[PDB]
Amino acid sequence: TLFVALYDYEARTEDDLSFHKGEKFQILNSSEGDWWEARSLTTGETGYIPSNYVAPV
Amino acid sequence: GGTGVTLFVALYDYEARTEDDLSFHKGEKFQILNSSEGDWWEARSLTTGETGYIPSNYVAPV
Amino acid sequence: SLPTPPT
Ligand code: NA
Structure with missing residues (x-):
């Protein structure tokens, strides 16, 4: 049931995660x-x- | 830069805005x-x- | 409200 990031994402709001591709x-x-x-x-x-x-x- | 998966699902309905667009429904x-x-x-x-x-x-x- | 992927 694991999910994987397809893309990097830079979150600028308090409650959203930033993450890297593959995380x-x-x-x-x-x-x-x-x-x-x-x-x-x-x-x-x-x-x-x-x-x-x-x-x- | 691309997507590692190639099989996608529509989250929303969409009406074509130009002749080369698809229209589709949620779930498609x-x-x-x-x-x-x-x-x-x-x-x-x-x-x-x-x-x-x-x-x-x-x-x-x- | 989703971002477009950076493709
Ligand atoms: Na944050």
Whole structure:
């Protein structure tokens, strides 16, 4: 159930994650629209990610 | 710079804004043919077989 | 409200 970043992303808002291509995530909440809550498996940080930037491993 | 996956799903309905656009509905599946222009992608609809432009932030990997 | 990928 791991997801992987297809692209780098630089987040400029408080609650959105920045991440690099290849970074791995666990999805915590996909129910609230097309920004998902996720945990980065690099940092352990939780925040929102754009769901079009990640794909299932 | 491109996408490592090639099979995408529409997150929203879209109405073509030009003759070379696809129109599509939420859930429709696509194979991406050219992502190199960035904001607009060339895709094949796996419903219609038609090829045309889609807005790249309307789709996500399956 | 999603970003366009940087392709
Ligand atoms: Na942030």
